[PDB]
Amino acid sequence: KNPQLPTQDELKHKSKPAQSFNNDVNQKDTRATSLFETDPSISNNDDSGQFNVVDSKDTRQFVKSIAKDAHRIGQDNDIYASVMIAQAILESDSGRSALAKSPNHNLFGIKGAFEGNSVPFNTLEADGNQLYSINAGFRKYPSTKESLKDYSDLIKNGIDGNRTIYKPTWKSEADSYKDATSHLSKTYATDPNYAKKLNSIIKHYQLTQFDDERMPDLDKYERSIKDYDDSSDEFKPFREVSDSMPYPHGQCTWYVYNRMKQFGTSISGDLGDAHNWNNRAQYRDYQVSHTPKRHAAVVFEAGQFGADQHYGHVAFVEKVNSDGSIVISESNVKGLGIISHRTINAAAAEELSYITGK
Ligand code: NA
Ligand code: NA
């Protein structure tokens, strides 16, 4: 009966992830968690692939806001500060989630209540590649001080009927941080890529530098972060541009809105679920046609070519090939919080709708 996972009552009322906000589903009850892209490096084998974090200045500053407290908490309570900081980054989307800022202050996505205080949120889950959402109560803290403390208490004390559920993440039980992240794989979240995501965060943000006895100087922290080789990629790397949130974080709709902004073009926040984008955009004075076009939003009608039967799908056109096929980028089709890409053949591409942003 692990409280961090979906309960029987939560699963009966499960929903498909919302792609748009309305009067019922809003920003105050929708989480934000870190997004990841597939590592462009050719892996040694079919199972050794990694994920790349979406690099960000918010993440760097979020690390500095808690690296000191995570370091001290780590040494005292036998916890990898790196794992703790990575989980904070992942679960709160580098501090940007409504669950992580005032007045909730829950940085680790811990469910339940704290000192009798709680806050309901829609939270994304996965059964392999089958994505769903559940509405659950999350611990509401007076500040981030009690959140960091409560995380350490969870790892050390565990749960009812399994007090040592997180004992294998303890520094004395796990030879390295990778042993610890692999045990969080099925005890903390349903996301089947949880460990690989944490490892990606730890590596890129050099979080092991906070695992040792003496903590380093935070003024030289940004100097240690090494960039990914992005010089031989075909397209501009993804980056979260805006602060505003017109669509639920990470969904296909949100991804296209943000990706379009990187190229200085916008699309409104009132287009609703993906399949309604083409007809609504057309009404709202956007150029919309069946001709494939570079950097346009590409819409799939409900149920079209495997797209979601109710919501359809929306993606961003990275390239229009000379043979008429298109290269698109999108989110949450390959897995939870995963940005992926593919090629749509010419005959299929000519049947989709392309929205030129303003
Ligand atoms: Na439509
Ligand atoms: Na499809």
Do 129 and 208 share a structural domain? yes
Tell me the residues surrounding ligand 1 (ion) with CB < 5 Å: 275, 278-279
Please, what is the Cα angle at 338 between 333 and 341, to 5 degrees?
60
Do 112 and 99 share a structural domain? yes
Cα 201 to ligand 1 centre (Å): 38
Would 236 be classed as within a structural domain?
A: no
Q: Which ligand is nearest to the CA of 305?
A: 2
Q: Which ligand is nearest to the CA of 275?
A: 1
Do 286 and 157 share a structural domain? no
| 3-class state of residue 46 by DSSP | coil
Q: Are 301 and 289 in contact (CB under 8 A)?
A: no
Count of domains for the chain: 2
Cα 87 to ligand 2 centre (Å): 32
Would 287 be classed as within a structural domain?
A: yes
Please choose, from the candidates 153, 205, 158, the residue with its C-alpha nearest in 3D space to the C-alpha of residue 177: 205
Question: In what side-by-side order are the strands of the sheet with 51-53?
Answer: 51-53, 36-38, 338-344, 326-331, 313-320, 297-300, 353-356, 287-289
Would 318 be classed as within a structural domain?
A: yes
195 Cβ contact partners less than 8 Å away, ≥ 6 residues apart: 178, 181, 182, 184, 185
Cα 237 to ligand 2 centre (Å): 23
Do 43 and 17 share a structural domain? no
Please, what is the Cα angle at 196 between 150 and 172, to 5 degrees?
50
Domain finish residue from 213, 235, 268? 213
> In whole angstroms, what is the distance from residue 271 CA to residue 278 CA?
8
SS3 content of the chain, % helix, strand, coil (to 5): 30, 20, 50
- Work out the angle between the directed axes of helices 194-204 and 177-184 (0-180°, nearest 10): 150
Please choose, from the candidates 74, 73, 70, 89, the residue with its C-alpha nearest in 3D space to the C-alpha of residue 172: 74
> What six digits make up the tokens of 284?
């709202």
Cα 206 to ligand 2 centre (Å): 37
Do 280 and 181 share a structural domain? no
> What six digits make up the tokens of 152?
């350490």
Would 229 be classed as within a structural domain?
A: no
Do 149 and 7 share a structural domain? yes
Domain that holds residue 254: 34-55+250-358
Q: Which ligand is nearest to the CA of 308?
A: 2
The DSSP code sequence of 194-236 is HHHHHHHHHHHTTGGGGTSSS---GGGHHHH-PPP--SS-SSP
Domain finish residue from 213, 228, 262? 213
Q: Which ligand is nearest to the CA of 271?
A: 1
Do 39 and 64 share a structural domain? no
Cα 333 to ligand 1 centre (Å): 19
Cα 300 to ligand 2 centre (Å): 8
| 3-class state of residue 263 by DSSP | coil
How were these coordinates obtained? X-ray
